[PDB]
Design a protein around this nucleic acid. Structure first.
Lengths: 311, 311
DNA sequence: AGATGGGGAATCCCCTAGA
DNA sequence: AGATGGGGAATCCCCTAGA
């Protein structure tokens, strides 16, 4: 028996919320763009076993995995973790209404530590997520009652070590499937699965890329035309304006508009000059596309139409 | 002997700083725009008296005057108040390097109360600024030593009453001139003078109005031409784009460009359509001016050139 | 010296609106 | 019901740079 991901959660787009912002904002969606489908991220317990217990924990997106400080809050959640069971005529368990609680930078340690304590007490992969020496605490711990001084200091040691590295802008979902052993009790899990990274849309570097409106929607094939482009929050240093045309054979033409970090108006507007076309001497016009592109991750905005006309 | 204001402090432009932002940011300037002059707000003790003691206190800009929660911090300051003496061959005392410490909304009461306590203990117009019943405390009080329980509860009563009304975005300067009585001691003040209101530039409604760059710098006399205007932070509902021409006789023509709150792009760009000119049929072009104007206070941005050409 | 700004990030607040 | 966004304000952080 192994656990797998049917549908990943949508990487970019969702917005983590600070405690204050309340709980009524929305749930993290799945990767599917299919029309008329709210699509929630999905997991599947492949190779059918007893009515399993699937849990979700927020882990880091660092080289080495470590528990995250943020909390999953929503429908099936308590103390940062999400718990739901897989019915026999439904080995698939989808997740609807999971929100991501954003901890403040100044409260990262005391929250990271509290999250570790609980998973140690709950046996939720403490060997993996806190310290390899707490491996025995797997599927054990006893709520406060059984967590002793030794484990406590180790939790403090890992927390201190990890809070400094902690990236509050991106998280990963880790599902663990706990199958049943002795009569009733679900205690043996399969290998946990970690999802793709979910980047907070409210983060400067993972913002939504969108060209709101352009000055000119056409330009002379030689380029050089000045266009005032209005867009969503960007960062002068890490932004590009990509012109491109995809030819049926899989080849693609691209030309980048010219502007300086200085031409990027307060993160919401960019003044640039059109790039030269592929071929100058042409008879009928050529429709290409315009879009923002983030150098760093290469994420793009939906394309915008642009018509190139002759010399 | 009466105290007067030679030069008011510049109303808009300065930025109040939160404690954290540090003290090295800058001093509040005067009203003068004269070239090559750093101009600091100025006061004058008219009708020459003994080497007076001029103090500055931050008061509210409400209908009725009340002490403000913010603090004056800078060169000659201690506990929110500014103190400097007027030398005989200099009855004029100018103020250089006064900063305005911005208290948070959540800490307004406990700070307002603390500021009142001190002025009561210092005799700095407590009858005026706190409660008319503490009038006796004028030029008296005795630091903690002499401030008793009665005055204390009155300070708590005024604070609670005033913190709710408190406008953290605008302050006024109140100068009081304390002339000398008995040998040495400066104890009798003239009528205090309150300056114009100083609005925090970091406040949404008193922001700096500036057109950074325009799409088109000219347009047909009939109007209707679409212009992409880049500007400093504005607020869709309270913004106008004013075209105007001043004719030597004092008469002024004005025409406002058309755009909807919706056309205001994320507070940093505005797309509007030019207004019709004054007269259609003309031979040589007419140079008018373009500028942003805030409906509320009518503050304006520096004008921008704009050339109207014929039908 | 000693006088001096500003952009934008991190956090948080409150809107609009259909059965 | 019960599922659901977003704009921008309030606060705060850290840049660049000349003797």
């Amino acid at each position: 028996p192994y656990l797998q991901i049917l549908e990943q959660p949508k990487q970019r787009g969702f917005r983590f919320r600070y405690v204050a912002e309340g709980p009524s904002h929305g749930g993290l969606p799945g990767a599917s763009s299919e029309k008329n489908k709210k699509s929630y991220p999905q997991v599947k317990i492949c190779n059918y076993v007893g009515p399993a217990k699937v849990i979700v924990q927020l882990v880091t997106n660092g080289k080495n995995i470590h528990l995250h400080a943020h909390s999953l809050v929503g429908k099936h959640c308590e103390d940062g973790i999400c718990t739901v069971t897989a019915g026999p005529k439904d080995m698939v368990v989808g997740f609807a209404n999971l929100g991501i609680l954003h901890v403040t930078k100044k409260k990262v340690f005391e929250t990271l530590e509290a999250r570790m304590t609980e998973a140690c007490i709950r046996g939720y992969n403490p060997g993996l997520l806190v310290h390899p020496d707490l491996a025995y605490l797997q599927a054990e711990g006893g709520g406060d009652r059984q967590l002793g001084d030794r484990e406590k200091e180790l939790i403090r040691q890992a927390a201190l070590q990890q809070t400094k590295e902690m990236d509050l802008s991106v998280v990963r979902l880790m599902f663990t499937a706990f199958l049943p052993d002795s009569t009733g009790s679900f205690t043996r899990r399969l290998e946990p699965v970690v999802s793709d990274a979910i980047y907070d849309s409210k983060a400067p570097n993972a913002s939504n890329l969108k060209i709101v409106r352009m000055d000119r929607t056409a330009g002379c094939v030689t380029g050089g035309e000045e266009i005032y482009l209005l867009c969503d929050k960007v960062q002068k240093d890490d932004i590009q304006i990509r012109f491109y045309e995809e030819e049926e054979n899989g080849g693609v033409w691209e030309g980048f508009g010219d502007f300086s970090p200085t031409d990027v108006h307060r993160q919401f507007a960019i003044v640039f000059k059109t790039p030269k076309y592929k071929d100058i001497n042409i008879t009928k016009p050529a429709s290409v596309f315009v879009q923002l592109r983030r150098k760093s991750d290469l994420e793009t905005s939906e394309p915008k139409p642009f018509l190139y006309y002759p010399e």
